Amino acid sequence: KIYFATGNPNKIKEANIILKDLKDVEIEQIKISYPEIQGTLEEVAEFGAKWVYNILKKPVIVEDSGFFVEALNGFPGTYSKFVQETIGNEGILKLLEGKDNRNAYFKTVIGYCDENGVRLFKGIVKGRVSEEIRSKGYGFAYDSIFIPEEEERTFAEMTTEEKSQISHRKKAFEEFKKFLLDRI
Amino acid sequence: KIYFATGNPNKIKEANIILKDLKDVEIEQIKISYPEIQGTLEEVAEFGAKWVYNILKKPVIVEDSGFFVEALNGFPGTYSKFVQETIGNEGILKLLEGKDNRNAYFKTVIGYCDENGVRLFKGIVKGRVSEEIRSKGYGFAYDSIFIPEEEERTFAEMTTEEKSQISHRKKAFEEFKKFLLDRI
Ligand SMILES: Nc1ncnc2c1ncn2[C@@H]1O[C@H](COP(=O)(O)OP(=O)(O)NP(=O)(O)O)[C@@H](O)[C@H]1O
């Protein structure tokens, strides 16, 4: 049993599916808020996990994710949500106007912590930003403008199952899983 | 004396000026770092104030400023530095192309914290965004695209003295000086 400090129940359902295999492990949501600090996703998740651990003192995880555009120097990055709300996807495309490098990537950092300390687990998916919003009604925010790896479709035109093995979130949770598996 | 948890010494030089008259004039820089949480400017200042106070256990002030543009919904706001270092002035001007509402404002929040608790002091200069970068060498970051109150020159084209009145930084501090003027 490991606690996930978040308000989104779906993150627990998602975590439990990637880890269903670990017969002896279970993920449970814990409604403890923590400050999300300014800094890298790593810094946000480490601080976050320690903050909740100090309070719950039981095995727990936190998570921070972001969208990074190359020609934009990694922006929006850890403030990807704030940017989505204020300038959104249109803002991103305006800023990429005339840029030849449309490369970008999503990345998730899970922050684990227990009596032994904090451990970071990462996942990334590299791709490129499309020139227009392309959507089949499938994703959130930046998904209508991100094309993963060798695909021609954006995340917004792919089903949950088409993105299940390639996503940063998926990749991050497989890393946390490795850690739980080969764990002593 | 009151400490200023800051790395810029000109900040404690700017602060002590405004503190001129007061008989407690003493503002003392102190190299104590604090987490700048994601939240409003007021949130960052409050968290930062109490954080370095619990460390130092003495009266201290922190200070957080931002550039907020109207058409862009507040952005960069409390993430002005990150935005300034990734997409720069160039980035907000592109975001603003074709927009007629070029309204914007700078804001500062001084977080004061005592053995009593936190008190916030604010300063604000409203204005508009320049159609292009304009500098004579003064100021930094967005100063060269911000035209204060009712001027025709940007902050970067005005001398430190010239914006003696149109300074969100001093306005926030004059506010702090009236709170000190009441304690004897
Ligand atoms: N209906 C839903 N409501 C809220 N959250 C959901 C829902 N469906 C799935 N989720 C969760 O939200 C996450 C995906 O968010 P999304 O914005 O697509 O990506 P992200 O990389 O986490 N964020 P960002 O980097 O800001 O784009 C998954 O981890 C899911 O657990």
Coordinates of N, CA, C and O in Angstrom, one line a residue, chain A residues 13-182:
Chain A
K13 N -6.2 5.5 -10.4 CA -6.7 4.4 -11.2 C -5.6 4.1 -12.3 O -5.4 2.9 -12.6
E14 N -5.0 5.1 -12.9 CA -4.0 4.9 -13.9 C -2.8 4.3 -13.3 O -2.2 3.3 -13.9
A15 N -2.4 4.7 -12.1 CA -1.2 4.1 -11.5 C -1.4 2.6 -11.1 O -0.6 1.8 -11.3
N16 N -2.6 2.3 -10.6 CA -3.0 0.9 -10.3 C -3.0 0.0 -11.5 O -2.7 -1.2 -11.4
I17 N -3.4 0.5 -12.7 CA -3.4 -0.4 -13.8 C -1.9 -0.7 -14.3 O -1.6 -1.8 -14.7
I18 N -1.1 0.3 -14.3 CA 0.3 0.0 -14.8 C 1.0 -0.9 -13.8 O 1.9 -1.7 -14.1
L19 N 0.5 -0.9 -12.6 CA 1.1 -1.8 -11.5 C 0.2 -3.0 -11.1 O 0.5 -3.6 -10.1
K20 N -0.9 -3.2 -11.8 CA -1.7 -4.3 -11.4 C -0.9 -5.6 -11.1 O -1.2 -6.4 -10.2
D21 N 0.1 -5.8 -12.0 CA 0.9 -7.0 -11.9 C 1.5 -7.2 -10.5 O 1.4 -8.3 -10.0
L22 N 2.0 -6.2 -9.9 CA 2.6 -6.3 -8.5 C 1.5 -6.7 -7.5 O 0.9 -5.9 -6.9
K23 N 1.2 -8.0 -7.5 CA 0.2 -8.6 -6.7 C 0.1 -8.1 -5.3 O -1.0 -7.8 -4.8
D24 N 1.3 -7.9 -4.7 CA 1.4 -7.4 -3.3 C 1.4 -5.8 -3.1 O 1.4 -5.4 -2.0
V25 N 1.3 -5.1 -4.2 CA 1.3 -3.6 -4.1 C -0.1 -3.0 -4.5 O -0.7 -3.5 -5.4
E26 N -0.4 -1.9 -3.8 CA -1.7 -1.2 -4.0 C -1.4 0.3 -3.9 O -0.6 0.7 -3.0
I27 N -2.1 1.0 -4.7 CA -1.9 2.5 -4.7 C -3.2 3.1 -4.1 O -4.3 2.8 -4.6
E28 N -3.0 4.0 -3.1 CA -4.2 4.6 -2.6 C -4.1 6.1 -2.4 O -3.1 6.7 -2.0
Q29 N -5.1 6.8 -2.9 CA -5.1 8.3 -2.9 C -5.1 8.7 -1.4 O -5.8 8.1 -0.6
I30 N -4.4 9.8 -1.2 CA -4.3 10.4 0.1 C -4.6 11.9 -0.2 O -3.8 12.5 -0.9
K31 N -5.6 12.5 0.4 CA -5.9 13.9 0.1 C -5.1 14.8 1.0 O -5.6 15.6 1.8
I32 N -3.8 14.9 0.8 CA -2.9 15.8 1.5 C -2.4 16.8 0.4 O -1.7 16.3 -0.5
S33 N -2.6 18.1 0.6 CA -2.1 19.1 -0.3 C -0.6 19.4 0.1 O -0.2 19.2 1.2
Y34 N 0.2 19.9 -0.9 CA 1.5 20.2 -0.6 C 1.9 21.4 -1.5 O 1.2 21.6 -2.5
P35 N 2.9 22.2 -1.2 CA 3.2 23.3 -2.1 C 3.9 22.8 -3.3 O 4.8 21.9 -3.1
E36 N 3.6 23.3 -4.4 CA 4.3 22.9 -5.6 C 5.2 24.1 -5.8 O 4.8 25.2 -6.1
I37 N 6.5 23.9 -5.7 CA 7.5 24.9 -5.8 C 7.9 25.3 -7.2 O 7.7 24.5 -8.1
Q38 N 8.5 26.4 -7.3 CA 9.0 26.8 -8.6 C 10.4 26.1 -8.7 O 11.2 26.1 -7.8
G39 N 10.7 25.6 -9.9 CA 11.9 24.8 -10.1 C 11.6 23.7 -11.1 O 10.5 23.7 -11.6
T40 N 12.5 22.8 -11.3 CA 12.3 21.7 -12.2 C 11.3 20.7 -11.7 O 10.9 20.7 -10.5
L41 N 10.7 19.9 -12.5 CA 9.7 18.9 -12.1 C 10.3 18.1 -11.0 O 9.7 17.8 -10.0
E42 N 11.6 17.8 -11.1 CA 12.3 17.0 -10.1 C 12.2 17.7 -8.7 O 11.8 17.1 -7.7
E43 N 12.6 19.0 -8.7 CA 12.5 19.8 -7.4 C 11.1 19.9 -6.9 O 10.9 19.7 -5.7
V44 N 10.1 20.0 -7.8 CA 8.7 20.1 -7.4 C 8.3 18.7 -6.8 O 7.6 18.7 -5.7
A45 N 8.7 17.6 -7.4 CA 8.3 16.3 -6.8 C 9.0 15.9 -5.6 O 8.5 15.2 -4.8
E46 N 10.3 16.2 -5.5 CA 11.1 15.9 -4.3 C 10.5 16.6 -3.1 O 10.2 16.0 -2.1
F47 N 10.4 17.9 -3.3 CA 9.8 18.8 -2.2 C 8.4 18.3 -1.9 O 8.1 18.1 -0.7
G48 N 7.6 18.1 -2.9 CA 6.3 17.6 -2.7 C 6.3 16.3 -1.9 O 5.6 16.2 -0.8
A49 N 7.0 15.3 -2.3 CA 7.0 14.0 -1.6 C 7.5 14.1 -0.2 O 6.9 13.5 0.7
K50 N 8.5 14.9 0.1 CA 9.0 15.1 1.5 C 7.9 15.8 2.3 O 7.7 15.4 3.5
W51 N 7.3 16.8 1.8 CA 6.3 17.5 2.5 C 5.1 16.6 3.0 O 4.6 16.7 4.1
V52 N 4.6 15.7 2.1 CA 3.5 14.8 2.4 C 4.0 13.7 3.4 O 3.3 13.3 4.2
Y53 N 5.3 13.3 3.2 CA 5.8 12.2 4.0 C 5.9 12.7 5.4 O 5.6 12.0 6.4
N54 N 6.4 14.0 5.6 CA 6.6 14.6 6.9 C 5.2 14.5 7.6 O 5.2 14.4 8.9
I55 N 4.2 14.6 6.9 CA 2.8 14.7 7.5 C 2.2 13.3 7.7 O 1.7 13.0 8.7
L56 N 2.3 12.4 6.6 CA 1.7 11.1 6.7 C 2.6 10.0 7.3 O 2.2 9.1 7.9
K57 N 3.9 10.2 7.1 CA 4.9 9.3 7.6 C 4.6 7.8 7.3 O 4.8 6.9 8.1
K58 N 4.1 7.6 6.0 CA 3.8 6.3 5.5 C 4.3 6.4 4.0 O 4.3 7.5 3.5
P59 N 4.6 5.3 3.4 CA 5.1 5.3 2.0 C 4.2 6.1 1.0 O 3.0 5.8 0.8
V60 N 4.7 7.2 0.4 CA 3.9 8.0 -0.5 C 4.6 8.5 -1.8 O 5.8 8.6 -1.9
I61 N 3.7 8.8 -2.8 CA 4.2 9.3 -4.1 C 3.5 10.6 -4.5 O 2.3 10.9 -4.1
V62 N 4.2 11.4 -5.2 CA 3.6 12.7 -5.7 C 4.0 12.7 -7.2 O 4.8 11.8 -7.6
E63 N 3.6 13.6 -8.0 CA 3.9 13.6 -9.4 C 3.8 15.0 -10.0 O 2.9 15.7 -9.6
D64 N 4.6 15.4 -10.9 CA 4.5 16.7 -11.6 C 4.9 16.4 -13.0 O 5.8 15.6 -13.3
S65 N 4.1 17.0 -13.9 CA 4.3 16.7 -15.3 C 4.4 18.0 -16.1 O 4.0 19.1 -15.7
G66 N 5.0 18.0 -17.3 CA 5.1 19.2 -18.1 C 5.4 18.9 -19.6 O 5.8 17.9 -20.0
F67 N 5.2 20.0 -20.3 CA 5.3 20.1 -21.8 C 6.5 21.0 -22.1 O 6.5 22.1 -21.6
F68 N 7.5 20.6 -22.9 CA 8.6 21.4 -23.2 C 8.9 21.6 -24.6 O 9.2 20.7 -25.4
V69 N 8.9 22.9 -25.0 CA 9.1 23.2 -26.4 C 10.5 23.7 -26.6 O 10.9 24.7 -25.9
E70 N 11.3 23.1 -27.5 CA 12.7 23.4 -27.7 C 13.1 24.8 -28.2 O 14.0 25.5 -27.6
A71 N 12.4 25.3 -29.2 CA 12.6 26.7 -29.7 C 12.2 27.7 -28.7 O 12.5 28.9 -28.8
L72 N 11.5 27.2 -27.6 CA 11.0 28.1 -26.6 C 11.9 27.9 -25.3 O 11.5 28.4 -24.2
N73 N 13.0 27.3 -25.5 CA 13.9 27.0 -24.4 C 13.4 26.2 -23.2 O 13.8 26.4 -22.0
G74 N 12.5 25.2 -23.5 CA 11.9 24.4 -22.5 C 10.6 24.9 -21.9 O 10.0 24.2 -21.1
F75 N 10.2 26.1 -22.3 CA 9.0 26.7 -21.8 C 7.9 25.9 -22.5 O 8.1 25.3 -23.5
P76 N 6.7 25.8 -21.8 CA 6.2 26.3 -20.5 C 6.9 25.5 -19.3 O 7.0 26.0 -18.2
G77 N 7.2 24.2 -19.6 CA 7.8 23.4 -18.6 C 7.0 23.1 -17.4 O 5.9 22.5 -17.4
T78 N 7.6 23.4 -16.2 CA 6.8 23.1 -15.0 C 5.6 24.0 -14.7 O 4.8 23.7 -13.8
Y79 N 5.5 25.1 -15.5 CA 4.3 26.0 -15.4 C 3.4 25.8 -16.6 O 2.8 26.7 -17.1
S80 N 3.4 24.6 -17.1 CA 2.7 24.3 -18.3 C 1.2 24.5 -18.1 O 0.5 25.0 -19.0
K81 N 0.6 24.2 -17.0 CA -0.8 24.4 -16.7 C -1.2 25.9 -16.7 O -2.2 26.3 -17.3
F82 N -0.4 26.7 -16.0 CA -0.7 28.2 -15.9 C -0.6 28.8 -17.3 O -1.4 29.6 -17.6
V83 N 0.4 28.3 -18.1 CA 0.5 28.8 -19.5 C -0.7 28.3 -20.3 O -1.3 29.0 -21.1
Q84 N -1.2 27.1 -20.1 CA -2.3 26.6 -20.9 C -3.5 27.5 -20.6 O -4.2 27.9 -21.5
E85 N -3.7 27.8 -19.3 CA -4.9 28.6 -18.9 C -4.8 30.1 -19.4 O -5.8 30.7 -19.7
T86 N -3.6 30.7 -19.5 CA -3.5 32.1 -19.8 C -3.3 32.3 -21.3 O -3.9 33.2 -21.9
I87 N -2.4 31.5 -22.0 CA -2.2 31.7 -23.4 C -2.5 30.5 -24.2 O -2.5 30.5 -25.4
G88 N -2.8 29.4 -23.5 CA -3.2 28.2 -24.2 C -2.4 27.8 -25.4 O -1.3 28.3 -25.7
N89 N -2.9 26.8 -26.1 CA -2.3 26.2 -27.3 C -2.1 27.3 -28.4 O -1.1 27.2 -29.1
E90 N -3.0 28.2 -28.5 CA -2.9 29.2 -29.6 C -1.6 30.0 -29.3 O -0.8 30.4 -30.2
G91 N -1.4 30.3 -28.0 CA -0.2 31.0 -27.5 C 1.0 30.3 -28.0 O 1.9 30.8 -28.5
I92 N 1.0 28.9 -27.7 CA 2.2 28.2 -28.1 C 2.4 28.3 -29.7 O 3.5 28.6 -30.1
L93 N 1.4 28.1 -30.5 CA 1.5 28.2 -32.0 C 2.0 29.6 -32.5 O 2.6 29.7 -33.5
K94 N 1.5 30.6 -31.8 CA 1.9 32.0 -32.1 C 3.4 32.1 -32.0 O 4.1 32.5 -32.9
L95 N 3.9 31.7 -30.8 CA 5.3 31.7 -30.4 C 6.1 30.8 -31.3 O 7.3 31.1 -31.5
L96 N 5.6 29.8 -31.9 CA 6.4 28.9 -32.8 C 6.3 29.3 -34.2 O 6.8 28.6 -35.1
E97 N 5.6 30.4 -34.5 CA 5.4 30.9 -35.8 C 6.8 31.2 -36.4 O 7.6 31.9 -35.9
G98 N 7.0 30.6 -37.6 CA 8.3 30.8 -38.3 C 9.5 30.0 -37.7 O 10.6 30.1 -38.2
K99 N 9.3 29.2 -36.7 CA 10.3 28.4 -36.1 C 10.5 27.1 -36.9 O 9.5 26.4 -37.2
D100 N 11.7 26.8 -37.2 CA 12.0 25.5 -38.0 C 12.0 24.4 -37.0 O 11.7 23.2 -37.4
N101 N 12.5 24.6 -35.8 CA 12.6 23.6 -34.8 C 11.3 23.6 -34.0 O 11.0 24.5 -33.2
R102 N 10.4 22.6 -34.3 CA 9.1 22.5 -33.7 C 9.2 21.3 -32.7 O 8.2 20.9 -32.2
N103 N 10.4 20.9 -32.3 CA 10.6 19.8 -31.4 C 10.2 20.2 -30.0 O 10.3 21.3 -29.5
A104 N 9.6 19.2 -29.3 CA 9.1 19.3 -27.9 C 9.0 18.0 -27.3 O 9.2 16.9 -28.0
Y105 N 8.6 17.9 -26.0 CA 8.5 16.7 -25.3 C 7.7 16.8 -24.0 O 7.6 17.9 -23.4
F106 N 7.0 15.7 -23.6 CA 6.3 15.7 -22.3 C 7.2 15.0 -21.4 O 7.9 14.1 -21.8
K107 N 7.0 15.2 -20.1 CA 7.9 14.5 -19.1 C 7.2 14.5 -17.8 O 6.6 15.5 -17.4
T108 N 7.2 13.3 -17.1 CA 6.6 13.1 -15.8 C 7.7 12.7 -14.8 O 8.6 11.9 -15.2
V109 N 7.6 13.2 -13.6 CA 8.6 12.9 -12.6 C 7.7 12.4 -11.4 O 6.9 13.2 -10.9
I110 N 7.9 11.2 -11.0 CA 7.2 10.7 -9.8 C 8.1 10.9 -8.7 O 9.3 10.7 -8.8
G111 N 7.6 11.3 -7.5 CA 8.4 11.5 -6.3 C 8.0 10.5 -5.3 O 6.9 10.6 -4.7
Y112 N 8.9 9.6 -5.0 CA 8.6 8.6 -3.9 C 9.3 9.0 -2.7 O 10.4 9.6 -2.7
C113 N 8.8 8.6 -1.5 CA 9.4 8.9 -0.2 C 8.9 8.0 0.9 O 7.7 7.8 1.1
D114 N 9.8 7.5 1.7 CA 9.5 6.8 2.9 C 10.5 7.0 4.0 O 11.3 8.0 3.9
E115 N 10.6 6.2 5.0 CA 11.5 6.3 6.1 C 13.0 6.4 5.5 O 13.8 7.1 6.1
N116 N 13.2 5.8 4.4 CA 14.5 5.8 3.8 C 14.8 7.0 2.9 O 15.9 7.2 2.4
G117 N 13.8 7.9 2.6 CA 14.1 9.1 1.8 C 13.4 9.2 0.5 O 12.5 8.3 0.2
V118 N 13.7 10.2 -0.3 CA 13.0 10.4 -1.6 C 13.7 9.8 -2.8 O 15.0 9.7 -2.8
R119 N 13.0 9.3 -3.7 CA 13.5 8.7 -4.9 C 12.7 9.3 -6.1 O 11.5 9.3 -6.1
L120 N 13.4 9.6 -7.2 CA 12.8 10.2 -8.4 C 12.8 9.2 -9.5 O 13.7 8.5 -9.7
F121 N 11.6 9.1 -10.2 CA 11.4 8.2 -11.4 C 10.8 9.0 -12.5 O 9.8 9.6 -12.4
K122 N 11.5 8.9 -13.7 CA 11.1 9.7 -14.8 C 10.7 9.0 -16.1 O 11.0 7.8 -16.3
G123 N 10.0 9.8 -16.9 CA 9.5 9.2 -18.2 C 9.4 10.4 -19.1 O 9.0 11.6 -18.7
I124 N 9.7 10.2 -20.4 CA 9.6 11.3 -21.4 C 9.2 10.7 -22.7 O 9.3 9.5 -23.0
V125 N 8.5 11.6 -23.5 CA 8.1 11.2 -24.8 C 8.5 12.4 -25.7 O 8.0 13.5 -25.5
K126 N 9.4 12.1 -26.6 CA 9.8 13.2 -27.6 C 8.9 13.2 -28.8 O 8.4 12.2 -29.2
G127 N 8.8 14.4 -29.4 CA 7.9 14.5 -30.5 C 8.1 15.9 -31.1 O 9.2 16.4 -30.9
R128 N 7.1 16.4 -31.7 CA 7.2 17.7 -32.3 C 5.8 18.4 -32.3 O 4.8 17.7 -32.1
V129 N 5.8 19.7 -32.3 CA 4.6 20.5 -32.3 C 4.0 20.6 -33.7 O 4.7 20.9 -34.6
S130 N 2.7 20.4 -33.8 CA 2.1 20.5 -35.1 C 1.8 22.0 -35.4 O 1.8 22.9 -34.5
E131 N 1.5 22.3 -36.7 CA 1.3 23.7 -37.1 C -0.1 24.2 -36.8 O -0.4 25.4 -36.8
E132 N -1.0 23.2 -36.5 CA -2.4 23.6 -36.2 C -2.9 22.6 -35.2 O -2.3 21.5 -35.0
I133 N -4.0 22.9 -34.6 CA -4.8 22.2 -33.6 C -5.4 21.0 -34.4 O -6.1 21.3 -35.4
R134 N -5.0 19.8 -34.1 CA -5.6 18.6 -34.7 C -6.2 17.8 -33.6 O -5.5 17.3 -32.7
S135 N -7.5 17.6 -33.6 CA -8.1 16.8 -32.5 C -9.3 15.9 -32.9 O -10.1 16.3 -33.7
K136 N -9.4 14.7 -32.2 CA -10.5 13.8 -32.4 C -11.3 13.7 -31.1 O -12.0 12.8 -30.9
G137 N -11.0 14.7 -30.2 CA -11.7 14.8 -29.0 C -11.1 13.9 -27.9 O -11.7 13.7 -26.9
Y138 N -9.8 13.5 -28.1 CA -9.2 12.6 -27.2 C -8.3 13.1 -26.0 O -8.2 12.4 -25.0
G139 N -7.7 14.2 -26.1 CA -6.9 14.6 -24.9 C -7.2 15.8 -24.2 O -8.3 16.3 -24.1
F140 N -6.2 16.3 -23.5 CA -6.3 17.5 -22.7 C -5.3 18.5 -23.2 O -4.3 18.2 -23.8
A141 N -5.6 19.8 -23.0 CA -4.7 20.9 -23.4 C -3.8 20.8 -24.6 O -4.2 20.9 -25.7
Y142 N -2.5 20.6 -24.3 CA -1.4 20.5 -25.4 C -1.5 19.3 -26.3 O -0.7 19.2 -27.3
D143 N -2.3 18.3 -26.0 CA -2.4 17.1 -26.7 C -2.9 17.3 -28.2 O -2.5 16.6 -29.0
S144 N -3.6 18.4 -28.4 CA -4.1 18.8 -29.8 C -3.0 19.4 -30.6 O -3.1 19.6 -31.8
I145 N -1.8 19.6 -30.0 CA -0.7 20.1 -30.8 C 0.6 19.3 -30.6 O 1.7 19.7 -31.1
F146 N 0.6 18.1 -30.0 CA 1.8 17.4 -29.8 C 1.8 16.1 -30.6 O 0.9 15.3 -30.5
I147 N 2.8 15.9 -31.5 CA 2.9 14.7 -32.3 C 4.0 13.9 -31.7 O 5.2 14.3 -31.6
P148 N 3.7 12.7 -31.1 CA 4.7 11.8 -30.5 C 5.6 11.0 -31.5 O 5.1 10.3 -32.4
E149 N 6.9 11.1 -31.2 CA 7.9 10.3 -32.0 C 7.7 10.2 -33.5 O 7.7 11.2 -34.2
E150 N 7.5 9.0 -33.9 CA 7.3 8.7 -35.4 C 5.9 8.8 -35.9 O 5.6 8.3 -37.1
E151 N 4.9 9.2 -35.1 CA 3.5 9.3 -35.5 C 3.3 10.5 -36.4 O 4.2 11.3 -36.5
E152 N 2.1 10.5 -37.0 CA 1.7 11.6 -37.9 C 0.6 12.3 -37.2 O 0.1 13.4 -37.6
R153 N 0.0 11.6 -36.2 CA -1.2 12.1 -35.5 C -0.7 12.7 -34.2 O 0.4 12.3 -33.7
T154 N -1.4 13.7 -33.7 CA -1.2 14.3 -32.4 C -1.8 13.4 -31.3 O -2.5 12.5 -31.7
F155 N -1.6 13.7 -30.0 CA -2.1 12.9 -28.9 C -3.7 13.0 -29.0 O -4.4 12.1 -28.5
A156 N -4.2 14.1 -29.4 CA -5.6 14.4 -29.5 C -6.4 13.6 -30.5 O -7.6 13.6 -30.5
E157 N -5.7 12.9 -31.4 CA -6.3 12.0 -32.4 C -6.0 10.6 -32.1 O -6.2 9.7 -33.0
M158 N -5.5 10.3 -31.0 CA -5.1 8.9 -30.6 C -6.0 8.5 -29.4 O -6.3 9.4 -28.6
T159 N -6.3 7.2 -29.3 CA -7.1 6.8 -28.2 C -6.1 6.4 -27.0 O -5.0 6.2 -27.2
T160 N -6.7 6.4 -25.9 CA -6.0 6.0 -24.6 C -5.1 4.8 -24.9 O -3.9 4.8 -24.4
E161 N -5.6 3.8 -25.6 CA -4.8 2.6 -25.9 C -3.7 2.8 -26.9 O -2.7 2.2 -26.9
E162 N -3.9 3.8 -27.8 CA -2.8 4.1 -28.8 C -1.7 4.8 -28.1 O -0.6 4.8 -28.6
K163 N -1.9 5.4 -27.0 CA -0.9 6.2 -26.3 C -0.4 5.5 -25.0 O 0.5 6.0 -24.3
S164 N -1.0 4.4 -24.7 CA -0.7 3.7 -23.4 C 0.7 3.2 -23.2 O 1.1 3.1 -22.0
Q165 N 1.4 2.9 -24.2 CA 2.8 2.4 -24.1 C 3.9 3.5 -24.4 O 5.0 3.3 -24.1
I166 N 3.5 4.5 -25.0 CA 4.4 5.6 -25.4 C 4.5 6.8 -24.5 O 5.5 7.5 -24.7
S167 N 3.5 7.0 -23.7 CA 3.4 8.2 -22.9 C 4.5 8.3 -21.8 O 5.0 7.3 -21.3
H168 N 4.8 9.6 -21.4 CA 5.8 9.9 -20.4 C 5.3 9.3 -19.0 O 6.1 8.9 -18.2
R169 N 4.0 9.4 -18.8 CA 3.4 9.0 -17.6 C 3.5 7.5 -17.5 O 3.9 7.0 -16.4
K170 N 3.3 6.8 -18.6 CA 3.4 5.4 -18.6 C 4.9 5.0 -18.3 O 5.2 4.0 -17.5
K171 N 5.8 5.7 -19.0 CA 7.2 5.4 -18.8 C 7.7 5.7 -17.4 O 8.6 5.0 -16.9
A172 N 7.2 6.7 -16.8 CA 7.6 7.1 -15.4 C 7.1 6.0 -14.5 O 7.9 5.6 -13.6
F173 N 5.9 5.5 -14.6 CA 5.4 4.4 -13.8 C 6.0 3.1 -14.0 O 6.0 2.2 -13.1
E174 N 6.6 2.8 -15.1 CA 7.3 1.6 -15.4 C 8.7 1.6 -14.6 O 9.2 0.6 -14.2
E175 N 9.2 2.9 -14.5 CA 10.4 3.1 -13.8 C 10.2 2.9 -12.3 O 11.1 2.3 -11.6
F176 N 9.1 3.4 -11.8 CA 8.7 3.3 -10.4 C 8.5 1.8 -10.1 O 8.9 1.2 -9.1
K177 N 7.9 1.1 -11.1 CA 7.6 -0.3 -11.0 C 8.9 -1.2 -10.9 O 9.0 -2.1 -10.1
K178 N 9.9 -0.8 -11.7 CA 11.2 -1.5 -11.7 C 11.7 -1.4 -10.3 O 11.9 -2.5 -9.7
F179 N 11.7 -0.2 -9.8 CA 12.1 0.1 -8.4 C 11.4 -0.8 -7.3 O 12.0 -1.2 -6.4
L180 N 10.0 -0.9 -7.5 CA 9.2 -1.7 -6.6 C 9.6 -3.2 -6.8 O 9.6 -4.0 -5.8
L181 N 9.7 -3.7 -8.0 CA 10.0 -5.1 -8.3 C 11.4 -5.5 -7.7 O 11.4 -6.1 -6.7
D182 N 12.4 -5.1 -8.4 CA 13.8 -5.4 -7.9 C 14.1 -4.8 -6.5 O 15.3 -4.7 -6.2

